[PDB]
Amino acid sequence: AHPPNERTHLVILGAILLALGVALTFIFRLRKGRLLDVKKSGIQDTNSKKQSDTHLEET
């Protein structure tokens, strides 16, 4: 039976509590960058203009 066994509960809960933190921290660190500026693209993000920049005389 061994009545005095409350110290094992503290050591087992302690490691289990910290271990959870490592899993959350591990994903939290990698999580950064995935959303931090995904890539930012805008090929069709400019004004349209299918005309010559300048003309020689008229055209």
From Swiss-Prot:
Disease entry from the Swiss-Prot or TrEMBL record: Truncation of the 3'-untranslated (3'-UTR) region of CD274 transcripts leads to elevated expression of CD274 in multiple cancers including T-cell leukemia, diffuse large B-cell lymphoma and stomach adenocarcinoma. Disruption of 3'-UTR region is caused by structural variants that stabilize CD274 transcripts, leading to overexpression. Increased expression in tumors promotes immune evasion and tumor cell growth by allowing malignant cells to escape destruction by the immune system.
Post-translational modification remark: Ubiquitinated; STUB1 likely mediates polyubiquitination of PD-L1/CD274 triggering its degradation. Ubiquitinated by MARCHF8; leading to degradation. Deubiquitinated by USP22; leading to stabilization.
Cytoplasmic compartment spans: 29-59
Induction or repression: Up-regulated on T- and B-cells, dendritic cells, keratinocytes and monocytes after LPS and IFNG activation. Up-regulated in B-cells activated by surface Ig cross-linking.
Entry's family note: Belongs to the immunoglobulin superfamily. BTN/MOG family.
Transmembrane stretches, start-end: 8-28
Summary of the function given for this chain in its UniProt record: Plays a critical role in induction and maintenance of immune tolerance to self. As a ligand for the inhibitory receptor PDCD1/PD-1, modulates the activation threshold of T-cells and limits T-cell effector response. Through a yet unknown activating receptor, may costimulate T-cell subsets that predominantly produce interleukin-10 (IL10). Can also act as a transcription coactivator: in response to hypoxia, translocates into the nucleus via its interaction with phosphorylated STAT3 and promotes transcription of GSDMC, leading to pyroptosis. The PDCD1-mediated inhibitory pathway is exploited by tumors to attenuate anti-tumor immunity and escape destruction by the immune system, thereby facilitating tumor survival. The interaction with PDCD1/PD-1 inhibits cytotoxic T lymphocytes (CTLs) effector function. The blockage of the PDCD1-mediated pathway results in the reversal of the exhausted T-cell phenotype and the normalization of the anti-tumor response, providing a rationale for cancer immunotherapy.
Protein localization: Cell membrane; Early endosome membrane; Recycling endosome membrane; Nucleus
Protein name stated in the entry: Programmed cell death 1 ligand 1
Tissues with expression: Highly expressed in the heart, skeletal muscle, placenta and lung. Weakly expressed in the thymus, spleen, kidney and liver. Expressed on activated T- and B-cells, dendritic cells, keratinocytes and monocytes.
Range of the intact protein held here: 232 to 290 of 290
Record text on subunit structure and interactions: Interacts with PDCD1. Interacts (via transmembrane domain) with CMTM4 and CMTM6. Interacts with (phosphorylated) STAT3; promoting nuclear translocation. Interacts with CD80.
